[PDB]
């Protein structure tokens, strides 16, 4: 039985014998729905996933350079020039430098100096587009206790899904995938097997060398200068040196961005949020007021308190009169046995006709002292329980 | 002849027939010293250099991790533990994580979780000490025109040096190596063949994994955590991932630090500054009032204006009466030939007794119009010259 250990757990109560109830489904969270004359159910947003993502743009964050060449001109002798100046495998820089008799020119003044160097990208990061046609939310439904579990796929192009639950009938989901998370201002950035969701403008403003799309043969790198610094201009040459890898720098610049992961070709996100409408007219308790279980239960574990104050118990049943209705309640007075608190796991049922079957119950005790009571008459079990509120 | 093309050029005039003159020697700069009845001289701080530098501390800036192991404990069941927790080849992290029936524990609460992973450093940067015993300033002296050139080595442990200049006698240097640059608050940092001088505290504050000195076998890396982030703690495990290379980050953090270079094992600096006392009693014009050159000169180049307003000329001489005293002056009136302006290259001399020898002169013209005059009588050369001040 799920949701019990989950920290981010909501409790939603139904309305009368009403059709619908609204829920907010968050990632790594769980919603427990309870309605009168309904089996208690568990809704969980398990995985948001994005397939078929299109490479929008790549940025080089580590490069190397070699084989530099320079051209210099004397004052009044024009612009310096190299063939490789417009060669896409090279990065260049024009500047001015002091010239005189000391270095070959017949007059003392600024001369033109160009320096080019072979450019090769070692590593790059890639920003991909996210279109709602390939977005897909995975939701798991589990009856509260016991094909009593279903998994459904809510997409922005199909926000309505129905899920059958065996002898409990079926539940219906109408979710708003629009109000989930905004992916028209977001890119899927990957860099050395680390993955984030980033904002489009921020991504476009990234001052690294770039190309669009990853075409074949040779990617044409724009703005190679960004990874290469030119220094110490002499009369006839100029020193070129790469900056470091800007990987850690980017990672630091992504300290507070949504983190995602990869799985095969499909991205998997964990920034879950999903408004949903739960339709519960076709949902039913196993529709048989069964005979109460006659034989005696026993605790397989001492009853434990969940983070939310509720109490989980697990019992083993010694009868073969299954399927039978489990007698379970809480009482302060052991004479009148007045039912206090309630059951999260509503109307529990032993469904197995073989002895020594196990059942989990989640009860919602009142404050102060109380007794967990399970069974009928003489062999019924009791267990002392205190609920200190906090 | 040096200094002419140099942008950072100082002009220091002597005093009477005085013993000393004070100069400030900067890197890539030059000082031209002129004293009456002295040959004009050129002082240049060429290279500051540091040998035998001792590794103070290394910082890892790129690493990799693999083979992670985790240990987790149920609530009230103690502290998690792994053997590798204290193993120096591993990086670990302790944390707490939600536990309950859902993941093996019999009670709902925080459990202890430790995760360790093999740690390997890919690349590192090294900070070395700089002791004034291995600091060494290289100074070049060149007579203004013409073993007329010397190179001397000023060290903090020998700030006094003497340099002979052939038939010009000798010059003496007493420098203050203390007031040069402060290297007791500086480290020599190298990182991927890039080199800076950095401040000690800043270097110590660098939050990267570190070790002292580079001993053999296996360096013990302190603070490995700095290159490794732990994420998304589950009940029984926890994801570990390296940050990027912090190379570019460091480079960015060094935008405004003194940049240096390497040469063999010896560091070479370019942040030159050196106060010096020039002793000039033993310095002499070639001590012979020679006969004036009788034959005729010719311009090998049109006279050019230096960045400092002065004018360089080069002449070829057609006589064999060398060694002889070059007749050179400037005049506004070509009748009285009144000497105007002066000569930087003071008392120029043809020293070669073979015809067609070359000589460079640097003259200091007055403002407005003037005539560069070189030679005697009929075959003397004139050249019109304007000095517009700026």
């Amino acid at each position, epitope marked *: 039985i799920r949701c019990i250990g989950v920290s981010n757990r909501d409790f939603v109560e139904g309305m009368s014998g009403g059709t619908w109830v609204d829920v907010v489904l968050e990632h790594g969270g769980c919603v427990t729905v309870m309605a009168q004359d309904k089996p208690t159910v568990d809704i969980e947003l398990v995985t948001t996933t994005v397939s078929n993502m299109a490479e929008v743009r790549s940025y080089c964050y580590e490069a190397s350079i070699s*084989d530099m060449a320079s051209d210099s001109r004397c004052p009044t002798q024009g612009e310096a020039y190299l063939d490789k100046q417009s060669d896409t495998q090279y990065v260049c820089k024009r500047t001015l430098v002091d010239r005189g008799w000391g270095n070959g020119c017949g007059l003392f003044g600024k001369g033109s100096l160009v320096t080019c160097a072979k450019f090769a990208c070692s590593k790059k990061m890639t920003g991909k587009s996210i279109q709602p046609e390939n977005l897909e939310y995975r939701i798991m439904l589990s009856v509260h206790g016991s094909e009593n579990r279903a998994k459904v796929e809510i997409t922005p192009n199909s926000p309505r899904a129905e899920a059958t639950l065996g002898g409990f009938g079926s539940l219906g989901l109408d979710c708003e995938p629009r109000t989930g998370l905004d992916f028209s201002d977001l890119y899927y950035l990957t860099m050395n097997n680390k993955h984030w969701l980033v904002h489009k403008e921020w991504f476009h403003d990234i001052p690294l060398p770039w190309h669009a799309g990853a075409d074949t*043969g*040779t990617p044409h790198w724009n703005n190679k200068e960004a990874l290469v610094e030119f220094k110490d201009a002499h009369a006839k040459r100029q*020193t070129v040196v790469v900056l470091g890898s800007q990987e850690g720098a980017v990672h630091t610049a992504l300290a507070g961005a949504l983190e995602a992961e990869m799985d095969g070709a499909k991205g998997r996100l964990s920034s879950g949020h999903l408004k949903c409408r739960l339709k519960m007219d076709k949902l039913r308790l196993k529709g048989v007021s069964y005979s109460l279980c006659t034989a005696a239960f026993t605790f397989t574990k001492i009853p434990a308190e969940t983070l939310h104050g509720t109490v989980t118990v697990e019992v083993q049943y010694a009868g073969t009169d299954g399927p039978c209705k489990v007698p379970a309640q809480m009482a302060v007075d052991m004479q009148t046995l007045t039912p206090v608190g309630r059951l999260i796991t509503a109307n529990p049922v032993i469904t197995e006709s073989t002895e020594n079957s196990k059942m989990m119950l989640e009860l919602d005790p009142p404050f102060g002292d109380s007794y967990i009571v399970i069974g009928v008459g003489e062999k019924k079990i009791t267990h002392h329980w205190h609920r200190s509120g906090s | 002849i040096r200094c002419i093309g140099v942008s950072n050029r100082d002009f220091v005039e002597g005093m009477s027939g005085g013993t000393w003159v004070d100069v400030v020697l900067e890197h890539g700069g030059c000082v031209t010293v002129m004293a009456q009845d002295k040959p004009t001289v050129d002082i240049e701080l060429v290279t500051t250099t540091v040998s035998n530098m001792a590794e103070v501390r290394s910082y890892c800036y790129e690493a990799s991790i693999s083979d992670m192991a985790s240990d987790s404990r149920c609530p009230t069941q103690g502290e998690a533990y792994l053997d590798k927790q204290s193993d120096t080849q591993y990086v670990c992290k302790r944390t707490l994580v939600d536990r309950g029936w859902g993941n093996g524990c019999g009670l709902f609460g925080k459990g202890s979780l430790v995760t360790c992973a093999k740690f390997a450093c890919s690349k590192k940067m090294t900070g070395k000490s700089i002791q004034p015993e291995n600091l060494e300033y290289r100074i070049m002296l060149s007579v203004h025109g013409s073993e007329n050139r010397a190179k001397v080595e000023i060290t903090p442990n020998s700030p006094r040096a003497e340099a002979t200049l052939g038939g010009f006698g000798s010059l003496g240097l007493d420098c203050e190596p203390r007031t040069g640059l402060d290297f007791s608050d500086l480290y020599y940092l190298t990182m991927n063949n890039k080199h800076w001088l950095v401040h000690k505290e800043w270097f110590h504050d660098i939050p990267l994994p570190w070790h002292a000195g580079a001993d053999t076998g296996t360096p013990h890396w302190n603070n490995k955590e700095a290159l490794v982030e732990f994420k998304d703690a589950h009940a029984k495990r926890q994801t570990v991932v390296v940050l990027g290379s912090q190379e570019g980050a460091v480079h960015t953090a060094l935008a405004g630090a003194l940049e240096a270079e390497m*040469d*063999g*094992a010896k560091g070479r600096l370019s942040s030159g500054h050196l106060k010096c006392r020039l002793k000039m009693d033993k310095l002499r014009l070639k001590g012979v009032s020679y006969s004036l050159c009788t034959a005729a000169f010719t311009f090998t180049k049109i006279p050019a204006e230096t960045l400092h307003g002065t004018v360089t000329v080069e002449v070829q001489y057609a006589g064999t009466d060398g060694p002889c005293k070059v007749p050179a002056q400037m005049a506004v009136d070509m009748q009285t030939l009144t000497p105007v302006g002066r000569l930087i290259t003071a008392n120029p001399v043809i020293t070669e007794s073979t015809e067609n020898s070359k000589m460079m002169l640097e003259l200091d013209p007055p403002f407005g119009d003037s005539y560069i005059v070189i030679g005697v009588g009929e075959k003397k050369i004139t050249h019109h010259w304007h000095r517009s001040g700026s």
Partner: antibody
Amino acid sequence: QVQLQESGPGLVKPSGTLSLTCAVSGGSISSSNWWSWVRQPPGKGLEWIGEIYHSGSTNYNPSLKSRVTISVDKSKNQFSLKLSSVTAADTAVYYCARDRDDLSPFDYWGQGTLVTVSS
Amino acid sequence: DIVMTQSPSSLSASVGDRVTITCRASQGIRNDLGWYQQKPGKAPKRLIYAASSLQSGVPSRFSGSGSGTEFTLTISSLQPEDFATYYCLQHNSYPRTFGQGTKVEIKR
């Protein structure tokens, strides 16, 4: 990974033209790699002749740039060297070679073919 | 054009000896220098790459150090298979240029 094999006539008339071809197998010649010609006169040292990228872009040794042309044939996965107006100074063992992708120096070499210049 | 001068030109050493070959560049090359081993009849093979970087398939007894204008290939423990002639190559400046080469013989 990749294998390089040179082929061409081992004899060239003085003032004639040396032609050599390097056939690359195991990998495409259109990878992010520069391809070089290097040579070595017998009993002497190595001299870098020239260089080409699959884009057709070339770099030649200045000492002999006026006489070399280097080209590519992606169709047959090879590249070629023309060296004109040869003298006995062009008598050497010729190697084709590859650079690695971090622009790093020769990471692969051919077997080497001797070419003599003689009448 | 940057000139690369190797020293010595030739060298005779016993097995197990430490051999130091020096390379000097007329201009600064940073660390863009490589070391190659040429066995007779065969093409040269890369031993080292960015002045320091030991390459795959090459025993760790080969090592490179230096920067700027001064570099050193050290072979720590000489072996019979190390009889060869070794070259240094600068590729910091177009055109790339080799040193004259250093021949390593063996004493036995």
